[PDB]
Amino acid sequence: LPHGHMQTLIFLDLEATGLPSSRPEVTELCLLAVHRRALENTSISQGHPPPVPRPPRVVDKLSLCIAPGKACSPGASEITGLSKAELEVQGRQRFDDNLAILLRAFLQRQPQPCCLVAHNGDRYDFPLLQTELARLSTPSPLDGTFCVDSIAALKALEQASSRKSYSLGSIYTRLYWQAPTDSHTAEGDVLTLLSICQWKPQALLQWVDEHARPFSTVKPMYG
Amino acid sequence: LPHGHMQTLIFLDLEATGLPSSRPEVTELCLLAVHRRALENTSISQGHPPPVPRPPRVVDKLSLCIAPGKACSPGASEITGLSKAELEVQGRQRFDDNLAILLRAFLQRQPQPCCLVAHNGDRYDFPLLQTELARLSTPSPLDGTFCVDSIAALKALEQASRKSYSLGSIYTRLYWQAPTDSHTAEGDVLTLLSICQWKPQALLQWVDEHARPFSTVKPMYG
Ligand SMILES: O=C1c2ccccc2C(=O)c2c1cc(S(=O)(=O)O)c(O)c2O
Ligand SMILES: O=C1c2ccccc2C(=O)c2c1cc(S(=O)(=O)O)c(O)c2O
Ligand SMILES: O=C1c2ccccc2C(=O)c2c1cc(S(=O)(=O)O)c(O)c2O
Ligand SMILES: O=C1c2ccccc2C(=O)c2c1cc(S(=O)(=O)O)c(O)c2O
Numbered sequence: 233l234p235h236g237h238m239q240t241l242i243f244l245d246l247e248a249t250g251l252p253s254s255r256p257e258v259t260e261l262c263l264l265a266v267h268r269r270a271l272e273n274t275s276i277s278q279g280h281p282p283p284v285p286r287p288p289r290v291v292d293k294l295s296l297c298i299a300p301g302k303a304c305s306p307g308a309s310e311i312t313g314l315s316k317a318e319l320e321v322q323g324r325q326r327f328d329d330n331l332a333i334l335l336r337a338f339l340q341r342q343p344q345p346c347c348l349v350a351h352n353g354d355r356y357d358f359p360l361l362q363t364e365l366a367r368l369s370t371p372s373p374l375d376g377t378f379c380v381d382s383i384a385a386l387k388a389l390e391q392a393s394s395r396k397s398y399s400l401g402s403i404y405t406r407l408y409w410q411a412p413t414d415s416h417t418a419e420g421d422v423l424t425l426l427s428i429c430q431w432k433p434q435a436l437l438q439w440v441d442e443h444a445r446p447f448s449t450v451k452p453m454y455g
Numbered sequence: 456l457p458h459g460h461m462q463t464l465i466f467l468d469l470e471a472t473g474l475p476s477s478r479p480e481v482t483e484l485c486l487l488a489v490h491r492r493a494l495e496n497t498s499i500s501q502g503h504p505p506p507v508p509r510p511p512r513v514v515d516k517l518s519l520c521i522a523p524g525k526a527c528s529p530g531a532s533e534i535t536g537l538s539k540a541e542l543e544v545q546g547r548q549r550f551d552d553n554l555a556i557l558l559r560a561f562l563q564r565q566p567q568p569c570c571l572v573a574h575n576g577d578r579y580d581f582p583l584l585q586t587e588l589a590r591l592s593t594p595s596p597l598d599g600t601f602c603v604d605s606i607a608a609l610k611a612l613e614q615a616s617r618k619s620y621s622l623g624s625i626y627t628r629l630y631w632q633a634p635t636d637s638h639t640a641e642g643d644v645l646t647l648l649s650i651c652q653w654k655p656q657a658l659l660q661w662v663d664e665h666a667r668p669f670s671t672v673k674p675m676y677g
């Protein structure tokens with residue numbers, strides 16, 4: 233194990249203004265922190281399909297709307313339900329120093345080591361978050377935090393139980409024969425991700441322990 | 456009128472170790488922050504019963520489990536699903552200085568003035584929170600924040616339209632449906648949001664009229 237057993241998994245999702253080529257900015261961020269014990273305690277999935285698992289009782293959750301410096305593209309606004317104008321008239325602040333202080337205090341409540349888990353995190357969420365943080369005067373709150381992409385995890389897990397779509401929704405529906413709730417909201421997508429990670433909790437944890445890498449090594453989306 | 460128009464409503468709920476006479480400690484806290492515009496934007500309740508309103512798109516949420524210094528009573532544990540032992544084995548921290556910093560930075564993201572809204576807040580949530588904060592070495596993050604009890608609000612609103620004013624009884628009267636996730640902090644906050652969205656304009660006006668400084672709330676115990 234490269235960095236020992238992860239004590240906390242933080243399921244993470246972002247909404248944003250557009251695609252990577254647009255140099256996008258985060259409009260919404262959700263963190264859901266679960267102790268490894270909470271995950272291993274979800275009862276094994278029986279039935280075909282199994283019921284969507286119960287979320288663990290003990291969770292910490294943070295969900296924030298964030299005013300971007302630039303407009304959301306039409307695609308972003310339509311599917312996320314967020315826009316710059318609406319965020320601003322509801323007094324949302326920018327991704328700023330106070331937000332990093334908030335993230336730091338939130339992370340401090342979680343036992344270490346801690347691992348961020350995000351769907352397609354390696355290509356979107358992690359590089360974008362790094363970019364947002366690098367622009368602040370506050371040091372990164374994620375510097376001692378680990379991270380993993382759940383696409384690769386579910387590829388491994390599904391490979392073993394046994395070409396397929398690994399979109400968040402396709403995975404969820406394949407496992408549970410149910411449409412995801414509140415897709416393209418940060419919180420909604422985090423909850424869907426939690427559910428798919430609860431499918432085979434022990435195997436998911438082991439994969440996470442094996443593949444967790446320092447967030448500090450994630451390259452920014454743009455500079 | 457007394458402190459102008461509240462720009463943000465923060466719906467709040469707490470779970471705890473027991474009844475007031477037990478000198479209880481918080482085991483769970485949920486804050487849900489909504490701009491007054493988001494509340495005014497929920498479409499008018501039509502039909503009898505009306506559909507449970509849609510939560511606004513734009514919300515900020517914080518939900519935290521907190522290790523108490525003392526054991527939960529048997530009643531608490533059974534109904535809340537939380538205990539000291541389980542909270543501790545999952546590494547939950549106490550209500551401490553870092554928690555206040557977290558609360559402060561969360562509040563700082565909201566336009567002022569800001570008003571806490573809690574069901575029976577005047578008798579339980581507000582005095583307990585005051586007690587928990589007064590224990591800390593960091594000044595209260597709620598010092599410039601206002602607060603109101605949604606029991607009185609819903610009494611007024613429903614009067615204008617003998618009844619139980621338990622959270623679930625109000626919800627069921629309005630929406631003819633049982634609430635979900637009762638006696639979880641977040642579950643109870645969501646239920647409260649739904650009942651406050653019943654008559655958004657009237658609710659806001661009541662809140663504007665009754666908002667009082669949180670700094671004037673007396674601690675549950677010393
Ligand atoms: O592909 C994505 C995407 C992929 C993974 C995580 C997040 C996003 C995302 O947030 C996003 C995307 C596309 C658009 S687009 O079609 O309008 O240019 C958006 O506006 C937008 O916000
Ligand atoms: O492809 C998109 C997308 C495309 C067009 C407009 C909006 C989005 C979008 O909002 C989005 C997307 C993907 C993810 S995912 O791949 O990381 O599950 C998201 O979390 C997410 O919010
Ligand atoms: O009155 C409460 C109460 C009121 C408002 C918010 C939260 C609680 C609460 O959490 C609680 C209460 C009573 C008991 S008791 O009957 O077993 O002593 C509990 O165990 C317990 O957890
Ligand atoms: O009376 C209780 C109670 C009694 C015994 C065990 C547990 C609880 C409890 O958990 C609780 C209670 C009241 C409220 S309320 O009056 O503010 O809606 C709550 O929010 C809440 O969580």
Ligand SMILES: [Mn+2]
Nearest residue numbers: 245246351421
């Ligand atoms: Mn995503």
Ligand SMILES: [Mn+2]
Nearest residue numbers: 246416417421
């Ligand atoms: Mn998303």
Ligand SMILES: [Mn+2]
Nearest residue numbers: 468469574643
């Ligand atoms: Mn309550």
Ligand SMILES: [Mn+2]
Nearest residue numbers: 469638639643
């Ligand atoms: Mn409650």
